[PDB]
Structures are given as structure tokens and as C-alpha cells.
């Protein structure tokens, strides 16, 4: 498989993407991105942030995690976030969502040496 860092580079990153996104990004997106084969991705977040910035937040305040671990962290100021997630309607393989635009905290877990970002846990 891939690495933990890079899937989630594949599916939570977009660094220059519109912070002013069309209806039609999540459709579009959630497809290019992969998250579109075996199955419909349920809910999903783009972070519109430099990666220097998102790698920095394994450097602050830690939080426990949703599976009850020692390596999450919670952001100390707010991202531009995407959330997309799917319609009532949706039948596989067409997967389709609602794109909702926000700007929240973000709390990531982070692992590994060089201690790099590997897994998105919640909006807050």
C-alpha cells in the first residue's frame, strides 16, 4: 500500500483550490481523488491550506483520539476547510454531494519519524 502520509496528502489536501468552491467541486473532486471507486466516501474535507502549515499542527497542544490514542493534536487557529458530503438520492456509481464551505479547526493525528501527519479525526 501506499503511505499513510500520502493517502492523506491524496485525500485531504488542496492547496490552492477555490475558498469560494462551485456546487459541482465535490462531485468533481471526491471522483479525481479516488474516493469515487468501490464505494461512495461518506463525508470528506479538503484542507486549502500550505502543507508547511498543516505539518506544523503535529507540534501543538495534544488531544486524545476518536480510537483513544496518545497522537492527535488540535489546531490553535482556524483552516479553510471543504466539506462534502453525500446526498440522500446517491446511487453507486453516481456518488453525489453537497459542497459546504467553512473555516473550523482541524485536529489531525500525527505518527511516524519524521513525525508527518497520517490520519483527518474532526472538525471543530
Known sequence: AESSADKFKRQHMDTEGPSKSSPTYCNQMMKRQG???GSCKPVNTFVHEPLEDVQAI????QVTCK???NNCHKSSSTLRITDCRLKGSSKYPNCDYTTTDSQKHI???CDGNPYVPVHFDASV
Open 35 to 37: 474516493m469515487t471507486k
Open 58 to 61: 503535529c507540534s501543538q497542544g
Open 107 to 109: 485536529i489531525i493525528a
Open 67 to 69: 480510537n483513544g490514542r
